[PDB]
Design an enzyme around this catalytic site. Structure first.
Site, PDB file in Angstrom:
ATOM      1  N   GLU A  11       0.820  -0.950   0.257  1.00 27.53           N
ATOM      2  CA  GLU A  11      -0.476  -0.140  -0.147  1.00 27.53           C
ATOM      3  C   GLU A  11       1.265   1.370   0.133  1.00 27.53           C
ATOM      4  O   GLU A  11       0.221   2.172  -0.753  1.00 27.53           O
ATOM      5  CB  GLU A  11      -0.844  -0.023   1.322  1.00 27.53           C
ATOM      6  CG  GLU A  11      -1.622  -1.497   1.472  1.00 27.53           C
ATOM      7  CD  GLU A  11      -2.843  -1.210   0.522  1.00 27.53           C
ATOM      8  OE1 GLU A  11      -3.439   0.047  -0.338  1.00 27.53           O
ATOM      9  OE2 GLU A  11      -3.423  -2.245  -0.210  1.00 27.53           O
ATOM     10  N   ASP A  20      -6.666   6.519  -4.712  1.00 30.11           N
ATOM     11  CA  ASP A  20      -6.354   4.868  -4.890  1.00 30.11           C
ATOM     12  C   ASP A  20      -6.223   4.294  -6.429  1.00 30.11           C
ATOM     13  O   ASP A  20      -7.031   4.906  -7.234  1.00 30.11           O
ATOM     14  CB  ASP A  20      -7.594   4.372  -4.272  1.00 30.11           C
ATOM     15  CG  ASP A  20      -8.443   3.611  -4.950  1.00 30.11           C
ATOM     16  OD1 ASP A  20      -8.864   4.247  -5.829  1.00 30.11           O
ATOM     17  OD2 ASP A  20      -8.948   2.500  -4.299  1.00 30.11           O
TER      18      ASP A  20
END
Ligand code: XQM
Ligand code: CL
Length: 162
Positions: A11, A20
């Site tokens: 991440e 994202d």
């Protein structure tokens, strides 16, 4: 290696609101703020999550606390789900990390399409599960992430992260 180091690799860490891979407002170590297109809605969710007026920026300590909460929530979601818990309990510790990783990324609803993969994992048919897991939108949209997670399920080692 452990679940925290694995997800930190997958991440990254950003201290300002970002988007994202699907375009959703996110912060920290992959913490989804909202699926709404409104940056103001995202800032409101951030302030509520942190407990202060952040104006879209957090500290590293705050990011790491959110991350601990999010990993805890993923584990609790597995343990409360009658479909996921028996599979999770059948896995060794390394493969359990791969399971948490998927739930962290896609949530309990996102994993609902993996019913055939779950059965193969519970039966320890690792190669067949790996092929079935790759036949997915998940693999086609984030192939490098998916390849690391699938390799962890297939081998029961950390080799894809080392
Ligand atoms: C895709 C997947 C989701 C949950 C578990 I537990 C195992 C595999
Ligand atoms: Cl990827």
């Amino acid at each position: 290696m452990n679940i925290f180091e694995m997800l930190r690799i997958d991440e990254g860490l950003r201290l300002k609101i970002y988007k994202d891979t699907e375009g959703y407002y996110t912060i920290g170590i992959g913490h989804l703020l909202t699926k709404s297109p409104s940056l103001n809605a995202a800032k409101s969710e951030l302030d509520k999550a942190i407990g202060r007026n952040c104006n879209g920026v957090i500290t590293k300590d705050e990011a790491e606390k959110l991350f601990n909460q999010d990993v805890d929530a993923a584990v609790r979601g597995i343990l409360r789900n009658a479909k996921l818990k028996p599979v999770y309990d059948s896995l060794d510790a390394v493969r359990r990390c791969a399971a948490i990783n998927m739930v962290f990324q896609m949530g309990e609803t996102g994993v609902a399409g993996f019913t055939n993969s779950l059965r193969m994992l519970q039966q320890k048919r690792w190669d067949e599960a790996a092929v079935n897991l790759a036949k997915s939108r998940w693999y086609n949209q984030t192939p490098n992430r998916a390849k690391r997670v699938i390799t962890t399920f297939r081998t029961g080692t950390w080799d894809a992260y080392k």
